[model samples]
Target: EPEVTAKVYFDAMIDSEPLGRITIGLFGKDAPLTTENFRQLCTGEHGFGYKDSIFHRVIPNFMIQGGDFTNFDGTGGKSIYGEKFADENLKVKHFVGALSMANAGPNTNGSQFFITTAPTPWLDGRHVVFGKVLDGMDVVLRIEKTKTNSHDRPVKPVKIVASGEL
Candidate 1:
């Protein structure tokens, strides 16, 4: 299969402001399972997805994390496959704009994922890099700049207002 693209529209200030959209290119050929999980979640074809979820964790000069559809926080989420799934491919390096699974440990990938705001070499072999930011990386930077509590939760509430295949 060919590469898959998806877009997520973000809303800030408790859904009162448009934060901009992010275009992501999923590396289906390299990580087919991981890619398909994100693609279907973006479209909500499985009746559950990233839409309406919050970017619960944001760290400056690092990465922004989200996709906890259940809790809207970093503590909860599940993959389409169930609680978690195996790591697909670790060939992709952790570079700026890299899209990677946010797992607790090996093969624990679920609905949660993160996008790098800078190169994170230590995560190269630990996380599954399934995609990259194709456009609107400025939006990711904007999220990274948002004020957060000690826990890194954005104070203004950045959320995915909508998402779908592109």
Candidate 2:
């Protein structure tokens, strides 16, 4: 498809401090294969290159579970792609700085993704809510929320030191 745009920028040493830009709106008309698998993992060749990944998992206001890029108990299991077609009736919502793509079932989104810290609203409309956090959101609330063990993952590491498209 055409006109697909993604622009997220978060840095400035995180914790906000003047850094924000989110505009993956209407990506390929509302979640086309989760926006082309998050633009082939932001054009790093979908080998799910979240370079040196780490945000293993976190859950402060209800979201921050980085992909298990290899270093969770899943024992290095997902991160291979290039087999499209994922629609699940495509509906988007999931507020609070929403930005998604992290699955294990139903077309399984590879290399994890998540960023919400409130306004869950019963996970609006279901899942696959393209992107929304236009800025650090307070450095994603200073990351690292703990206490885990049973799938909802994220025991204690939040490191995506770099993500692209801005």
Candidate 3:
């Protein structure tokens, strides 16, 4: 468990087409707890890890949220710890391509995360900015522009095709 400085990759699919791809680098130095929490979640060991999960919410010009593998509806999900952890001072800003934990309030983050499609200065402090997209932002743009139902859920079901560390 020597500091994990590696990047993670997430590929998405929609209607059997390549929806998008995303590469993320965790800010372990600043958000160690959050970084590791998300790492273990993506490891596939926990039966409800990030496989077959769909981007439950896609807000154009805002962000795309996912990692609710347990429910796929964005209502039920948990972390490997079964509880939330403290926030960290990552000194990271919420910009386009940024990856931040989605929590109910302070220290309530679990497996949910979102990728910003545009600069979001408003989310600078509420969520723990633990990672950032390293590549494939164009894919993020594509996902953002995808058609969604009245509830903001992708109508055709956009799924995470695969995810792993780099």
lDDT of 1 by residue, 135-162 (tens): 8888889889988987888888887888
Candidate lDDT (C-alpha), each = 0.84, 0.55, 0.82
Every model's TM-score: 0.92, 0.29, 0.92
Tens-digit lDDT string for candidate 3 (1-166): 1233768888889888985668888878878888888887776766667877889999998999998887888876788878667677535678777889988888788899999988788888788888888888988888888899888999988888888777
After aligning candidate 1 to the native by TM-score, how far in Å is the CA of 77 from where it should be?
1.0
- Residue 56 CA error for candidate 1 (Å)? 0.3
| Number of the predicted model whose lDDT against the real structure is largest | 1
Where model 2 places Cα greater than 4 Å from the true spot, the runs are 1-29, 37-39, 46-48, 65-91, 95-119, 122-128, 131-145, 148-166
Better of 1 and 2 by lDDT: 1
Candidate 1 lDDT at 82 equals: 84
